[PDB]
Amino acid sequence: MENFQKVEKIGEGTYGVVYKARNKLTGEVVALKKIRLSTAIREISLLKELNHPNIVKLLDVIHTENKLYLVFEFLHQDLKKFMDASALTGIPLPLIKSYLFQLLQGLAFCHSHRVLHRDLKPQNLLINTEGAIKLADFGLARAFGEVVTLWYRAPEILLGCKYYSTAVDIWSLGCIFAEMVTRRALFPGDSEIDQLFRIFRTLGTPDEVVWPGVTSMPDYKPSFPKWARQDFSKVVPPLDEDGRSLLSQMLHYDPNKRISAKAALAHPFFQDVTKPVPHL
Numbered sequence: 001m002e003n004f005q006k007v008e009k010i011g012e013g014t015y016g017v018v019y020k021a022r023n024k025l026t027g028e029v030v031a032l033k034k035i036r037l038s039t040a041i042r043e044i045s046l047l048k049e050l051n052h053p054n055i056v057k058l059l060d061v062i063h064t065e066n067k068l069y070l071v072f073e074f075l076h077q078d079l080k081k082f083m084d085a086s087a088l089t090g091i092p093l094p095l096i097k098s099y100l101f102q103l104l105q106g107l108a109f110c111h112s113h114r115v116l117h118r119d120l121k122p123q124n125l126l127i128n129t130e131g132a133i134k135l136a137d138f139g140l141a142r143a144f145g146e147v148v149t150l151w152y153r154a155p156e157i158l159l160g161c162k163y164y165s166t167a168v169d170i171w172s173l174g175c176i177f178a179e180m181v182t183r184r185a186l187f188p189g190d191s192e193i194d195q196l197f198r199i200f201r202t203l204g205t206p207d208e209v210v211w212p213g214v215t216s217m218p219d220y221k222p223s224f225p226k227w228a229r230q231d232f233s234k235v236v237p238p239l240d241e242d243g244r245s246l247l248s249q250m251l252h253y254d255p256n257k258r259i260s261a262k263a264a265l266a267h268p269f270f271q272d273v274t275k276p277v278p279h280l
């Protein structure tokens with residue numbers, strides 16, 4: 001590469017290959033995301049201004065040789081790998097709580113600046129060595145439009161709603177919270193309908209009482225099976241009532257009833273939050 005030394009594939013990202021790369025001029029290590037191929041360039045370039053401690057810094061947008069690359073700061077590890085490495089012991093609760101608190105601060109920041117993620121998942125959550133966690137790839141899905149992960153997708157998206165809101169990110173984060181606590185994905189679907197029925201079997205099939213308008217959504221079918229709703233108490237033991245209360249509010253069916261990031265930060269679950277050092 002003209003402008004990088006020591007370029008190494010990390011893996012396949014949402015939009016193309018992701019590399020660890022060394023900037024030739026400065027010697028810094030960055031995450032270089034190739035976008036597999038006018039409006040998207042200016043919109044993503046605005047994200048270079050969207051800066052916060054819990055947001056992965058977008059350093060540059062490189063548009064050269066009719067190719068597009070996003071340059072992000074490089075962080076030590078992603079949460080999917082950390083979760084896998086932590087599976088035998090579990091992530092300690094104080095660290096789960098710290099990470100959730102920080103992720104909510106990142107969401108609250110982006111949402112206050114009218115930027116959504118729309119595709120949060122553990123792979124886009126990055127950790128450093130001292131206890132910070134950051135979200136990557138905010139804003140890309142609006143700008144741009146191996147198998148896709150559906151496990152974190154909000155039910156309105158699965159039911160074919162064409163209108164995103166902040167609530168989609170709260171749903172995904174709730175699913176990630178549950179997975180940290182139980183060491184198992186909450187809703188590991190392998191197709192849209194398996195994902196949908198996995199949510200319905202746990203939370204009950206939604207209806208007009210809990211979710212006004214649900215029956216008029218594009219992909220809703222009156223023939224869906226009607227499951228009764230289970231209790232978070234069987235789903236995420238041994239999480240305490242404060243954690244279950246918060247999670248329950250993050251996973252309301254109606255996006256309009258889902259707790260906001262800002263309100264979640266005030267929840268009693270976080271009264272005793274701290275910032276521990278992770279065991280890498």
Ligand SMILES: O=C1CC(I)=CC=N1
Pocket residue numbers: 010018031073074075076077078123126
């Ligand atoms: O900065 C990063 C990105 C990814 I994907 C993995 C680890 N560090």
